[PDB]
Amino acid sequence: DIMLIILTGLPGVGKSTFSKNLAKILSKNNIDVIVLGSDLIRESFPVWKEKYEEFIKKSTYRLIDSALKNYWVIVDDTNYYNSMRRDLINIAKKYNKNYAIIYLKASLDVLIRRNIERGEKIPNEVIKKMYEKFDEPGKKYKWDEPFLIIDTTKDIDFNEIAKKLIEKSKEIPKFNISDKIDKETRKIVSEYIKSKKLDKDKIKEVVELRKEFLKKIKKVDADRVLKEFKDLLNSY
Amino acid sequence: MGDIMLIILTGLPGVGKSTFSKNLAKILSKNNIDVIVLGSDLIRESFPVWKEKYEEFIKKSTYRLIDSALKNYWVIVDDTNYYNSMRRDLINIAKKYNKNYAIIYLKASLDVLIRRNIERGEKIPNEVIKKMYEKFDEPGKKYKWDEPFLIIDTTKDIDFNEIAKKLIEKSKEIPKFNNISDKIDKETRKIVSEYIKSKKLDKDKIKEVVELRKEFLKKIKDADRVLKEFKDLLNSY
Ligand SMILES: Nc1ncnc2c1ncn2[C@@H]1O[C@H](COP(=O)(O)OP(=O)(O)NP(=O)(O)O)[C@@H](O)[C@H]1O
Ligand SMILES: Nc1ncnc2c1ncn2[C@@H]1O[C@H](COP(=O)(O)OP(=O)(O)NP(=O)(O)O)[C@@H](O)[C@H]1O
Ligand SMILES: [Mg+2]
Ligand SMILES: [Mg+2]
């Protein structure tokens, strides 16, 4: 009776806080659960470099795979693209475990204010673009439909959620390069902004630069594309 | 630049391993070295509670992360590494990939260890730190492969530029190369620490339990059965 819980939701929506609260209640019910997410490995490097992301991603999948043989796993990650949620569901599929996607939502104004209170580590402008561009889960594939959609500005009943997940766990389980380029150019942009401490007008400019660059890319070799993106930001 | 190296920390709780790791990782990265800091607490602290049955998973997961990382990055192993068997296991990972390694032994006076502990809410009982201090075998006491590359006094300022220089020099060199008792010693200590913390034992109950453990370990001298019995003993007591 092991299940895979897949969080999804934009930066600052409260994934990690929700993960820790849910884990506490599950363990109260004598469920063995582990919270795993890419930041565990990413933040173990003293700096960020794009070449680290492959190791970060694989390491995170490996831990989840190993963990899910013996424990419930809560995947604490933005999981912005359907391709990521697919990779995770395929881990559950490998071991015939049930899974539940839990989509955490909040308005853009809430995410911005939360970002501001945590020291605006990711740029506000970047959260705004992510918000505009986000394809909400379940809008394409039936396997991607959320088990729960949770408004994190309203009271959340963790006992009820726990009850529902343990019920689900007893049920019979039923079952991109463009994404990488999109994901890493965004991270590169955020890092440059933070590194070079760009002003608000410069921030708008580089976010717009990225948008234009990606239109050109679309209308590919990832490493060449990302290297050129870096060179472009430097040039600009 | 050139080569990859495994850096193995060792030292008692509160000595400053995690702080040292972050400072060292920063100076290595400043020199364009790709380095990652990995320790068993990454995985241990991802569970909402501690249970002894998690530890084998925690151990194996951590070794697998270290193994996978060392293929591409310097790795700083941020763990107490209280037993020489642990330092052996880590060295065998370096050996498997023919990578240099360096044990860095961090030290401080019992005095300072306790003050630091206290300064963090006594997350581990002071009495337990004391007992670890007494029973600790310093690296290199027995095997030459176990000898510290550096011994750092954390009671004093640390020259990280000097340390980075020495490690980088080491990394260009040509590399040269029961635990059931450790497991029981280790988990009974953790169980004791957990009981003290969760039943808020007073100072005197703490001493009895610490002594209870040593007596127990003398009598016992497979791990699951023995550990279940130890828990039963503490409950009974
Ligand atoms: N349910 C909630 N209600 C109010 N505030 C919250 C809630 N959840 C999280 N927060 C606050 O929002 C901020 C971000 O929360 P966190 O749990 O770190 O979000 P996250 O989605 O995990 N962020 P990230 O890891 O960067 O994508 C923190 O400062 C929290 O205190
Ligand atoms: N060199 C130092 N000088 C003064 N204080 C220090 C030093 N190193 C660490 N500390 C402080 O001591 C406390 C414990 O440091 P930490 O780096 O967590 O130790 P640790 O060895 O990693 N502990 P643990 O993970 O429990 O084995 C922290 O509050 C530090 O700020
Ligand atoms: Mg988070
Ligand atoms: Mg530490």
Curated annotation (Swiss-Prot), chain A:
Catalytic activity: L-seryl-tRNA(Sec) + ATP = O-phospho-L-seryl-tRNA(Sec) + ADP
Class of this enzyme: transferase
Positions annotated to bind ATP: 9-16
Pathway entry: Aminoacyl-tRNA biosynthesis; selenocysteinyl-tRNA(Sec) biosynthesis; selenocysteinyl-tRNA(Sec) from L-seryl-tRNA(Sec) (archaeal/eukaryal route): step 1/2
Record key words, sorted: ATP-binding, Kinase, Nucleotide-binding, Transferase
EC number(s) on file: 2.7.1.164
One function term, GO molecular function aspect: L-seryl-tRNA(Sec) kinase activity
Any one Gene Ontology BP term: tRNA wobble uridine modification
Pfam families: KTI12
Function: Specifically phosphorylates seryl-tRNA(Sec) to O-phosphoseryl-tRNA(Sec), an activated intermediate for selenocysteine biosynthesis.
Family: Belongs to the L-seryl-tRNA(Sec) kinase family.
Protein name per the record: L-seryl-tRNA(Sec) kinase
Organism annotation: Methanocaldococcus jannaschii (strain ATCC 43067 / DSM 2661 / JAL-1 / JCM 10045 / NBRC 100440) (Methanococcus jannaschii)
